[PDB]
Design an enzyme around this catalytic site. Sequence first.
Site, PDB file in Angstrom:
ATOM      1  N   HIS A  39       0.666  -1.031  -0.041  1.00 52.49           N
ATOM      2  CA  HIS A  39       0.238  -0.010  -0.080  1.00 52.49           C
ATOM      3  C   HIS A  39       0.366   1.474  -0.198  1.00 52.49           C
ATOM      4  O   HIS A  39       0.243   2.645   0.288  1.00 52.49           O
ATOM      5  CB  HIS A  39      -0.645  -0.066   1.323  1.00 52.49           C
ATOM      6  N   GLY A 141       3.312   5.259  10.130  1.00 57.78           N
ATOM      7  CA  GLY A 141       4.876   5.235   9.374  1.00 57.78           C
ATOM      8  C   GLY A 141       5.459   4.585   9.990  1.00 57.78           C
ATOM      9  O   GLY A 141       6.129   3.899   9.255  1.00 57.78           O
ATOM     10  N   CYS A 143       4.132   0.821   9.026  1.00 57.88           N
ATOM     11  CA  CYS A 143       4.092  -0.199   7.868  1.00 57.88           C
ATOM     12  C   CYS A 143       5.385  -0.367   7.870  1.00 57.88           C
ATOM     13  O   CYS A 143       6.193   0.418   7.624  1.00 57.88           O
ATOM     14  CB  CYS A 143       3.416   0.149   7.417  1.00 57.88           C
TER      15      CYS A 143
HETATM   16  C1  LIG Z   1      -5.345   3.214  11.455  1.00 55.90           C
HETATM   17  C2  LIG Z   1      -6.451   2.616  10.632  1.00 55.90           C
HETATM   18  C3  LIG Z   1      -7.741   3.975  10.723  1.00 55.90           C
HETATM   19  C4  LIG Z   1      -5.685   3.792   9.641  1.00 55.90           C
HETATM   20  C5  LIG Z   1      -6.949   2.062   9.638  1.00 55.90           C
HETATM   21  N1  LIG Z   1      -7.019   0.551   9.678  1.00 55.90           N
HETATM   22  C6  LIG Z   1      -8.098   0.015   9.019  1.00 55.90           C
HETATM   23  O1  LIG Z   1      -8.253  -0.047   7.984  1.00 55.90           O
HETATM   24  C7  LIG Z   1      -8.458  -1.110   9.688  1.00 55.90           C
HETATM   25  F1  LIG Z   1      -9.221  -1.627  10.380  1.00 55.90           F
HETATM   26  F2  LIG Z   1      -9.353  -2.056   8.735  1.00 55.90           F
HETATM   27  F3  LIG Z   1      -7.932  -1.705   9.966  1.00 55.90           F
HETATM   28  C8  LIG Z   1      -4.709   1.601   8.770  1.00 55.90           C
HETATM   29  O2  LIG Z   1      -3.833   0.647   9.680  1.00 55.90           O
HETATM   30  N2  LIG Z   1      -4.076   1.373   8.116  1.00 55.90           N
HETATM   31  C9  LIG Z   1      -4.836   2.260   6.500  1.00 55.90           C
HETATM   32  C10 LIG Z   1      -4.815   2.033   4.856  1.00 55.90           C
HETATM   33  C11 LIG Z   1      -3.209   1.218   5.870  1.00 55.90           C
HETATM   34  C12 LIG Z   1      -2.992   1.227   6.975  1.00 55.90           C
HETATM   35  C13 LIG Z   1      -2.425   1.780   7.720  1.00 55.90           C
HETATM   36  O3  LIG Z   1      -1.988   3.587   8.382  1.00 55.90           O
HETATM   37  N3  LIG Z   1      -1.343   1.038   8.545  1.00 55.90           N
HETATM   38  C14 LIG Z   1      -0.255   2.464   9.419  1.00 55.90           C
HETATM   39  C15 LIG Z   1       1.780   1.998   8.669  1.00 55.90           C
HETATM   40  N4  LIG Z   1       1.835   2.727   8.256  1.00 55.90           N
HETATM   41  C16 LIG Z   1       0.315   1.728  10.725  1.00 55.90           C
HETATM   42  C17 LIG Z   1      -1.290   1.899  10.751  1.00 55.90           C
HETATM   43  C18 LIG Z   1      -1.076   3.681  11.500  1.00 55.90           C
HETATM   44  C19 LIG Z   1      -2.339   3.764  13.316  1.00 55.90           C
HETATM   45  N5  LIG Z   1      -1.069   2.197  13.413  1.00 55.90           N
HETATM   46  C20 LIG Z   1      -0.457   1.244  12.697  1.00 55.90           C
HETATM   47  O4  LIG Z   1      -0.476   0.560  13.577  1.00 55.90           O
HETATM   48  C21 LIG Z   1      -3.947   0.510   4.940  1.00 55.90           C
HETATM   49  C22 LIG Z   1      -5.467  -1.148   5.846  1.00 55.90           C
HETATM   50  C23 LIG Z   1      -4.214   0.178   3.670  1.00 55.90           C
END
Ligand SMILES: CC(C)(C)[C@H](NC(=O)C(F)(F)F)C(=O)N1C[C@H]2[C@@H]([C@H]1C(=O)N[C@H](C=N)C[C@@H]1CCNC1=O)C2(C)C
Lengths: 297, 299
Positions: A39, A141, A143
């Site tokens: 992503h 950030g 990820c």
């Molecule tokens: C947190 C949230 C509402 C945003 C969302 N979650 C859901 O949509 C869920 F519900 F489906 F899980 C979510 O994690 N993302 C939205 C988008 C990526 C991912 C994301 O931002 N990843 C971060 C990597 N840098 C790590 C996160 C940041 C906060 N703490 C973490 O660990 C993706 C699935 C493509």
Amino acid sequence: FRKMAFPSGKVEGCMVQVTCGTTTLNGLWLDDVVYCPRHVICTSEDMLNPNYEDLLIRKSNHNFLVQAGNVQLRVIGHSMQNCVLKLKVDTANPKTPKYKFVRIQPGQTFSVLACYNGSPSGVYQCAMRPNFTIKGSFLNGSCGSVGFNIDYDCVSFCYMHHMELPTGVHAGTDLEGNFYGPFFDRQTAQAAGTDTTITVNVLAWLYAAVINGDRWFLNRFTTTLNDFNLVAMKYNYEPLTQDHVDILGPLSAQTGIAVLDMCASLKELLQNGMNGRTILGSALLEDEFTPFDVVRQ
Amino acid sequence: FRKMAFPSGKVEGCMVQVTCGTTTLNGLWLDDVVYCPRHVICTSEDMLNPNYEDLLIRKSNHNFLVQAGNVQLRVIGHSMQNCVLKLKVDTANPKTPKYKFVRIQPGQTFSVLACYNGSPSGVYQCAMRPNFTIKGSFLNGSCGSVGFNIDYDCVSFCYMHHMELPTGVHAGTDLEGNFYGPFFDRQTAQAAGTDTTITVNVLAWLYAAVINGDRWFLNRFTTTLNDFNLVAMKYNYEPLTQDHVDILGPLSAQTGIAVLDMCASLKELLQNGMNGRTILGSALLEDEFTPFDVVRQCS
Ligand SMILES: CC(C)(C)[C@H](NC(=O)C(F)(F)F)C(=O)N1C[C@H]2[C@@H]([C@H]1C(=O)N[C@H](C=N)C[C@@H]1CCNC1=O)C2(C)C
Ligand SMILES: CC(C)(C)[C@H](NC(=O)C(F)(F)F)C(=O)N1C[C@H]2[C@@H]([C@H]1C(=O)N[C@H](C=N)C[C@@H]1CCNC1=O)C2(C)C
């Protein structure tokens, strides 16, 4: 008896920063390939409903900015493997450890090296929950941060971080990009299945308490495996298998407490509660130490 | 909310083993000096009643085996500074990080890199207790393992491991060889003193709960620091210093809850209990998270 992570140095030397457009996260640089969550290719709007093959075909190598420290690595190729992107770069990582990619089982533990903008932040121990979430500490950030175990200087990578669920737990993939659990990398509300307690780990931890001089929870009673699993299932604990009983062997031999005798102790703990007492300083039954974890420490 | 150690790589590249006779422990290799517990020069029988000055007199450079992995580093000089030995070696460690030696106060936390035969084994967070012990995890051969904090690429070494007390807690020195607490590197009956709860860290933990929206415990009262200190000690809590009040400054500003207001909230918790309610999902007040640890994890 502490939650103890593996030394993170061998993994720190592998962390890089990956940017596509305005999206930035961490990657794992092994030899001449950088692994990161796919992503990264998504704009904010893309993440709400991405068609990844369609988004990826529209990208060029030069759309990927990879930074290792202050040094840019040139991407010379890229492919997608499930939910992971594999960026071929024009430089081999001289700090690549001996490594393997493994997919772990619910209940196993691993260390997490939490990273931001390619830089290590902290290290802590985690377990794969039975519902295939992990109770991590991850911010924006993070990820591309990875989980791992180390065995005689070989790093076994088992986890790469992708998302946080609304309950605050975390979901991710193995290093082949296949999610643990029924989750998917679309920004839309996702709930995990009901979680359960890792019974073999609770027992290993009770054995740790006895190896460290705490015996107050033991009793004179015994139980059969089947009668124990009935009570465990009633309390949302995972079944205890004969393999589990065998794995607990060295801990039982070390303490002279038969596994089924320790099961009777846990059964009484479950039915009577802890009554404001603590075990290894904890007010609750701890289930994120494996038998191997206990022995190693 | 969980304990998080610093990345340990910068310290891993500094760990070596030091053997004297048949006693092997760990040492810390920074530039061309290796630091290690002086009792490496003791026989097991010497440890029962050591005269370190006399034992060091009978040692020469060629009695010290320093190894990085299986690679020997030639010792070219040795001296004793309090309870640590400094072995000058003929090679400067190219993995030496920017570093400082600091002496920490009770309540402060640090990461421990547990090491055996110079090989790093694991990493975990520890707090210095008010009785100057740490609730560590150490086995035979762990002496010379170090504790540290990192700020912006600079490693602050604060602890070197020497010994285990009968209650299973651990004692050691700073990197100048000065013990924390009233302990000595002699194998003789010694005991950890009575301990107390680290008040400033409990307050930090309450601020962490408020930040995350768990704030039922906020009361409508306030107190003075002197009044709070006198009551807190009646519950085996540490008194607060001026430095404690100031290190809670950032969390106080972030939440808008004055330090003394949070102190009154804590006093009510001590005098009346939690009434079955939890804080951050815990029935117990956690006292090994510093105000820095709370900010570090949230940033
Ligand atoms: C947190 C949230 C509402 C945003 C969302 N979650 C859901 O949509 C869920 F519900 F489906 F899980 C979510 O994690 N993302 C939205 C988008 C990526 C991912 C994301 O931002 N990843 C971060 C990597 N840098 C790590 C996160 C940041 C906060 N703490 C973490 O660990 C993706 C699935 C493509
Ligand atoms: C515990 C013994 C009962 C063994 C003793 N303790 C006391 O004499 C006390 F009770 F006074 F503390 C003790 O620790 N030592 C005896 C001797 C050194 C030290 C020692 O063996 N250090 C080990 C470093 N490799 C780390 C230990 C090993 C077990 N776990 C640890 O952490 C010294 C003080 C010179």
